[PDB]
Design a protein around this ligand. Structure first.
Ligand SMILES: [K+]
Ligand SMILES: [K+]
Ligand SMILES: [Mg+2]
Ligand SMILES: [Mg+2]
Ligand SMILES: [Mg+2]
Ligand SMILES: [Mg+2]
Ligand SMILES: [Mg+2]
Ligand SMILES: [Mg+2]
Ligand SMILES: [Mg+2]
Ligand SMILES: [Mg+2]
Length: 224
RNA sequence: UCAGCUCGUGUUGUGAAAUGUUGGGUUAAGUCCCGCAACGAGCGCAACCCUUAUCCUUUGUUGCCAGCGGUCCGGCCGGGAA
């Protein structure tokens, strides 16, 4: 992607100056109307490198986990992960999804053993109220684990929208050595991210631009 | 007979420990929902047990007497299964 595409989407629009993290100072171009403007001259070469490294991991048959539970990037993280056949978390990240994977697994199993029952017909059997409490455990397990049900283990990379909002996921990945790619706005701390991509993480326009180019370089990375 | 008491893994703290189990509502209830660095699990709560309140089906004596038929007026007798 190029500098003009980032502009029309609003990638260069940061937060108000009073909310900045001073560690973001190198990636800042200036301020306009008391709002920080990210330096797109750095967003481009840093994203391409992130797009380059994501390509290699996909070529080696790696698993990419897309994390974005904000109400702006929620439904797009799921669309980008599917059109790419990888995995995603787009509702509240469960603390310990990765560092406590050996426990969160048993909830993936329960999600499977309860979906085959939705497909079997055991819900037409139960005493109504018992089938109704089981169809509700389904939707809850689906909303939280529906994107990682086939992951079958720790992923090899994480792509995150908003490093601050998903600070727990990033900490879990650093804990296990899993490389973190993340969009980092001006109010966020870039110290945990291995591949920083400074850019607006709130506008739906900019998010889709990030997710499209990443979903592309992994589809191409899985072909070769 | 009060609704409590804990553990595994994870995470936080040099540590004793903490979190979960707190919060917003709700319930007889740590009851349930929602939120949530927690995710799950156990012992308790509830349910499963006995009894009581309504109805059905079967069975009809030592229990029963609606319609019958007699009568010493006693279901007493013949019967009747209501
Ligand atoms: K302390
Ligand atoms: K513990
Ligand atoms: Mg320690
Ligand atoms: Mg207690
Ligand atoms: Mg405690
Ligand atoms: Mg409460
Ligand atoms: Mg309980
Ligand atoms: Mg809680
Ligand atoms: Mg009880
Ligand atoms: Mg008579």
């Amino acid at each position: 992607v190029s500098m003009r595409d980032m502009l029309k989407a609003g990638v260069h629009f940061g937060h108000q100056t009073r909310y900045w993290n001073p560690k973001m100072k190198p990636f800042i171009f200036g301020a306009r109307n008391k709002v920080h403007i990210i330096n797109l001259e750095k967003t481009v070469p840093m994203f391409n490198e992130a797009l380059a490294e994501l390509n290699k991991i996909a070529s080696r048959k790696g698993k990419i986990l897309f994390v974005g539970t904000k109400r702006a990037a929620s439904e797009a993280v799921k669309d980008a992960a599917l059109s790419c056949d990888q995995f995603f978390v787009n509702h509240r990240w469960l603390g310990g999804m990765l560092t406590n994977w050996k426990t969160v697994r048993q909830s993936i199993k329960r999600l499977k053993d309860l979906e085959t029952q939705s497909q079997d017909g055991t819900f037409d059997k139960l005493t109504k109220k018992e089938a109704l409490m089981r169809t509700r455990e389904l939707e809850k397990l689906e909303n939280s684990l529906g994107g990682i049900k086939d992951m079958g283990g720790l992923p090899d990379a994480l792509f995150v929208i908003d490093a601050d909002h998903e600070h727990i996921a990033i900490k879990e990945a650093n804990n296990l050595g899993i490389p973190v790619f993340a969009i980092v706005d001006t109010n966020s701390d870039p110290d945990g991210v291995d591949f920083v991509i400074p850019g607006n993480d709130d506008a739906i326009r900019a998010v889709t631009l990030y997710l499209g180019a990443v979903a592309a370089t992994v589809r191409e990375g899985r072909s070769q």
